[PDB]
Every structure is written in structure tokens, then in C-alpha cells.
Design a binder for this molecule. Structure first.
Ligand SMILES: Nc1ncnc2c1ncn2[C@@H]1O[C@H](COP(=O)(O)OP(=O)(O)O)[C@@H](O)[C@H]1O
Ligand SMILES: [Mg+2]
Length: 465
């Protein structure tokens, strides 16, 4: 059919532009490290901000007391509460409540955002049961995870640099995010002090090390993507204070903003960025993250539907709608194994609004999902590889003796729930490492680990009382 060769040409340029041979991945990992060095010396125009987090001591286990945590949150926010027992007892009690963020609150007024989340924290502390005790006269203390880039000014204070992953609230850039929350808690008649402000990457790394001593980094793969790691404070040229007692510092790399001419981008990525909420920003994230994967698939399917009549001789109206194909929908289609792809086809009926689909159209769709998820997962593995190279963990002992154990905590709905994405991520990372080096790296799932991690860092920075 002519329509068949016209479809093969589209799929062929997708394969060509999206191609990520291991050799290219090593050059991208090298460029990541190059960019990490630029951000640590405060280079102008550095894509990676490499933010000092003021976390110089990760949790040890001896944390004790009662502490709350507020976790925000690209798609949801959760309020957490733990009773910490100490090196031997640990988390005696724990309670949490997760709430989905209404879509308007991502793009409205900052007072509406913080009023909404502070009101849910209010009704949450009001149900504080008897398993959690607060000594008399004392003030309840909070750990605040703020999943957006913040120029840190103390362990508990920081300026919003910019919004990401679907958020766009005027009037917060430049403002202290902890003061903005503190005011909202006050308007709710709520006695709490924020004693720790962390990015969700820094929090997951805190929560990860609390249960595994070898956690060296945290990678987030959810609605957005980002990563944090532990750096040597004497390896940060832009550091100007004293130097931490522990010689360590957690860095929020903000690696979604990574950009490199080595990144295999296409016209679909240019169009996606052009019509986005933050054009020109977060180039790397827009190839990896959950908010954008399904949208890349939709734009490829649209090209096919138009240039090859893939879904009929009239392009389906719904297919032209932006973000109509969410990434969990992409994930559902991708995992269909039935001989006729009946579940991929059932999903396509909802999302496209068509009555039916060719078996051949279903296999093309499955192939597109495959190419988009594969490129995102391989590039994310290249980023993790770059971190390991920064910590000198890409290689094993030369003296031939003593393999280290390096743990990387992973968090986010993409990694947790997109099976093909996760296994492609881990396979490529193991490929990038040697067979010798890979047996020393652990990818641990620490989902929503910034909740307890923010509570732990609020603990070690209490007032007290
Ligand atoms: N089944 C799935 N398949 C693919 N991606 C998913 C799936 N479930 C969730 N996700 C992605 O993970 C995100 C939710 O992850 P989570 O870390 O809880 O929130 P956020 O990253 O928004 O703070 C969603 O926005 C979605 O992009
Ligand atoms: Mg979640």
C-alpha cells in the first residue's frame, strides 16, 4: 500500500533520531559530569544548578521525637507524622494522608496553593492520635519537601528559582517558600515551625540512608525527573562559608535542565518544548519524565495518523488534543501481550475516540511506545552513570581487592509502575557499568522517601521543642 511505505518512513526517522547506542550514552554521561563541574563552580549559564542543600549530615538512626512532614509534590501532596524512637526503636508510629493536587492550583495564586495544603495539614494534626506525644509547651516541628528548584539560604529557608512539571504560579519566583507556607499555616491557626526545607531528591536520599547506610544518591522519576547525591564540600568551588564538620554536602543537581547537543532530540521534541509551559527549560526532563512520555507518543501517532491514515482516512479529533494520551495510558498499552493486542486496542478506542483499529495499527502503536520509553530509560541510565562517575563509582578496585557497595535510591511513579521502563533503565545502567562494576551498584526503590526523610532532617535540626 502506498500508505504502508509512508508509515515506514516516519517510523524510520523516529528510530534514527531517538537512537541511543551505548557509545552515545557514554558521551552523554561524560557531558553530565562536565556540567556538574560547571554548576559547582557557579559558572554562568550552567544548565545544572547544583544547589547547595545545607544538608551536611544525613540521618543516622538516632533520631527521636515526634515530627511532621509536608511533601509537595508534582501531582499530589502528602502530610506525614512519625514518632521516632532512636537507634534501637526507630519509627514507633507512622501515619500519612495523600491528596491529589487540583489542576487549577498548579497555575493559580500562590496563596491558593499554600492555603489548600495548609488546610489539609490543619485537619491532619487535629486528628493526632495517642500514639504520638508532644511534650508540654513544645512547638510541633515540620520538614518541608518542596519538589521544585530552590536557591537554598539555610537548612530551612529558600527562594523559588522557577516552577517545573506543570506548575506555573506568578509571584512566587524570588520568594521564600518556607515563609509562604508559614504564613498560610498561620492563617489556619496552626502552630508549627518548619525546621528543614529540602527538595524531594534530597529528602529521598535522607530517607534512603535512614534504612541503608550505602545510599549515595537519589534519582526521582515521576511527573518530572531530578537527582541528588552526596558531594565532598571541598570539591564545590562555589562554597564560601566555613566547611561542614562532616566534609559532606548533598547537592540538588536539578538535572532535568540538562541540555547537550549529544541528546538525541527530534522535531517532536521541539514542538513539545515550543508548546510547553516552560519553553526552553528542562530539555532533558522532557525526554524522560512521566509528564512528557505519553505526549511524545501522541505527537508521533499524530504524524502517522496524518501522513499514513493510520487510524482511518480522517485523523481522530481527540488525537490532536495535547496531553490526551497520558503516560500511564502509554504504559498500559506497552505491556499488552495478547496475540491481537486487544487491551492496547481498547485503550486506543478511549483515547482516540475511534471505533476500531487495524492489527497493524496496534503493532505500530506498540512500537512507538517502545521507542519513546526506550530512549527515556536509556538517557536516564546515562544520567545515573554520570553520577556514579562523579563519585568515582563507575570502576571497581584496581588493587584488585574490595568491591564497594553503592546504593541509589529511586522514587517516582514512572520508575515504580512502568515495568518496561524500569527494566530497560537497569539493563542499560548495568551495560554502562562493567559486569564487574555493576555487581557493586544497587538500585533501591524508596518511593515517597522524601516524606520521612524531611521529617528526619527536621528532627536533627529541632529547636528543640
Ligand atoms: N502506571 C504508570 N505508568 C507510567 N507512569 C506513571 C504510572 N503511574 C504514575 N506514573 C507517573 O508518576 C507520576 C506520579 O508519581 P509521584 O512521584 O507519586 O508524583 P510526582 O512525581 O508528581 O510528585 C505521575 O504524574 C505519572 O507521570
Ligand atoms: Mg505517589
Amino acid at each position: 500500500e502506498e500508505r504502508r511505505r509512508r508509515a515506514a518512513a516516519v517510523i524510520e526517522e523516529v528510530e534514527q533520531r531517538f537512537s541511543t547506542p551505548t557509545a552515545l550514552l557514554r558521551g552523554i554521561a561524560d557531558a553530565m559530569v562536565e556540567e556538574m563541574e560547571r554548576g559547582l563552580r557557579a559558572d554562568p549559564h550552567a544548565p545544572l544548578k547544583m544547589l547547595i542543600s545545607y544538608v551536611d549530615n544525613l540521618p543516622t538512626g538516632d533520631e527521636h521525637g515526634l515530627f511532621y512532614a509536608l511533601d509537595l509534590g508534582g501531582t499530589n501532596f502528602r502530610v506525614i507524622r512519625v514518632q521516632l524512637g532512636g537507634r534501637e526503636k526507630r519509627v514507633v508510629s507512622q501515619q500519612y494522608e495523600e491528596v491529589a493536587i487540583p489542576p487549577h492550583l498548579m497555575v493559580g495564586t500562590s496563596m491558593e496553593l499554600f492555603d489548600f495544603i495548609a488546610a489539609e495539614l490543619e485537619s491532619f494534626v487535629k486528628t493526632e492520635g495517642e500514639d504520638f506525644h508532644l511534650p508540654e509547651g513544645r512547638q510541633r516541628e515540620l520538614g518541608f519537601t518542596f519538589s521544585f528548584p530552590v536557591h537554598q539560604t539555610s537548612i530551612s529557608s529558600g527562594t523559588l528559582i522557577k516552577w517545573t512539571k506543570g506548575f506555573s504560579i506568578n509571584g512566587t519566583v524570588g520568594e521564600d517558600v518556607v515563609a509562604e507556607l508559614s504564613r498560610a499555616m498561620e492563617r489556619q491557626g496552626l502552630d508549627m515551625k518548619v525546621t528543614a526545607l529540602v527538595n524531594d531528591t534530597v529528602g529521598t536520599l535522607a530517607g534512603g540512608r535512614y534504612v541503608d547506610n550505602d545510599v549515595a544518591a537519589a534519582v526521582i522519576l515521576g511527573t518530572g525527573t531530578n537527582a541528588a547525591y552526596v558531594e565532598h564540600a571541598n570539591a564545590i568551588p562555589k562554597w564560601t562559608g566555613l566547611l561542614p564538620r562532616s566534609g559532606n554536602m548533598v547537592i540538588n543537581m536539578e538535572w532535568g535542565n540538562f541540555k547537550s547537543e549529544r541528546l538525541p532530540r527530534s522535531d517532536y521534541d521541539n514542538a513539545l518544548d515550543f508548546e510547553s509551559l516552560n519553553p526552553g527549560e528542562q530539555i532533558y526532563e522532557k525526554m524522560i519524565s512521566g509528564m512528557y512520555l505519553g505526549e511524545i507518543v501522541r505527537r508521533i501517532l499524530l504524524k502517522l495518523a496524518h501522513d499514513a491514515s493510520l487510524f482511518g482516512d480522517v485523523v481522530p479529533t481527540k488525537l490532536e488534543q495535547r496531553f490526551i494520551l497520558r503516560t500511564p495510558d502509554m504504559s498500559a498499552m506497552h505491556h499488552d501481550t495478547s496475540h491481537d493486542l486487544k487491551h492496547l486496542g481498547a485503550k486506543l478506542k478511549d483515547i482516540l475516540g475511534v471505533a476500531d483499529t487495524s492489527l497493524e495499527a496496534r503493532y505500530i502503536t506498540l512500537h512507538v511506545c517502545d521507542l519513546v520509553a526506550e530512549r527515556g530509560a536509556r538517557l536516564a541510565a546515562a544520567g545515573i552513570y554520570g553520577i556514579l562517575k562523579k563519585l568515582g563509582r563507575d570502576r571497581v578496585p584496581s588493587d584488585g581487592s574490595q568491591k564497594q557497595r553503592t546504593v541509589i535510591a529511586l522514587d517516582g511513579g514512572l520508575y515504580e509502575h512502568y515495568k518496561k521502563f524500569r527494566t530497560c533503565l537497569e539493563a542499560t545502567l548495568a551495560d554502562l557499568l562493567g559486569e564487574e562494576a555493576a555487581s557493586s551498584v544497587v538500585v533501591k526503590l524508596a518511593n515517597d522517601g522524601s516524606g520521612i526523610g524531611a521529617a528526619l532532617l527536621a528532627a536533627s535540626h529541632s529547636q528543640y521543642a
